[PDB]
Amino acid sequence: RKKKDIRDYNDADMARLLEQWEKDDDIEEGDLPEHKRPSAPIDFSKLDPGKPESILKMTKKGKTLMMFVTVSGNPTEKETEEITSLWQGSLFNANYDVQRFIVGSDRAIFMLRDGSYAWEIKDFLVSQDRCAEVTLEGQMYPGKG
């Protein structure tokens, strides 16, 4: 196995849907009181501004990516697919900073626009071996320029 067991950055996050297989409901919570996000350029080191109008006109999807889970039983395949979307946002930040891992009857997920910075808290986060939090918003393009 490997925390970086990604399919060359595509839609591995969707794999989380497998969690539904358990349906043990180890946790009763899952959704937290989220809200709008700050609109501004965010990157790990520096973005690549001054881009052409073609690319920009091509498509624009700026959103914040942040989710932490590590338990058995997560019936939310639908919401999973939505994760792939937020992934695009991380691109503008650095270059897709998401990690996935599967062990036993429980799976853990971790996605952040920065990644490295999150790796710090991720230590204790995954160490808990029991967490169910999710956060996804897209107001005023919270991240991507």
3-state SS record for 64-132: EEEEEEEECCCCCHHHHHHHHHHHHHHHHHCCCCEEEEEECCEEEEEEECCCHHHHHHHHHHHHHCCCE
- Cα Rg, the chain, nearest whole Å: 16
Size of the chain in residues:
145
* H/E segment holding residue 135: strand 132-137
- φ/ψ of 40, rounded to 5, equals 180, 160
Taking alpha carbons only, the member of 124, 126, 118 closest to residue 42 is: 118
Query: What's the distance, CA 34 to chain centroid?
Result: 15
* H/E segment holding residue 54: helix 53-58
Supply 142's token pair: 């919270």
Could you count the other beta carbons within 10 Å of the beta carbon of residue 16? 23
Amino acid at position 49, single letter: P
Q: How far apart are CA 109 and CA 68, in angstroms?
A: 6
Q: How far apart are CA 50 and CA 57, in angstroms?
A: 14
Can you say whether residue 84 is alpha, beta or left, with left for phi > 0 and alpha for psi between -120 and 50 degrees? alpha
Contact between 63 and 89 under an 8 Å Cβ cutoff? The reply is yes
- Measuring CA to CA, how many Å separate 78 from each of 25, 81, 139? 17, 6, 21
Taking alpha carbons only, the member of 113, 101, 106, 29 closest to residue 67 is: 113
Contact between 13 and 109 under an 8 Å Cβ cutoff? The reply is yes
Task: Say if residue 4 is exposed, middle or buried (CB neighbours under 10 Å; 0-12, 13-18, 19+).
Answer: exposed
Per DSSP, 50 falls in state: S
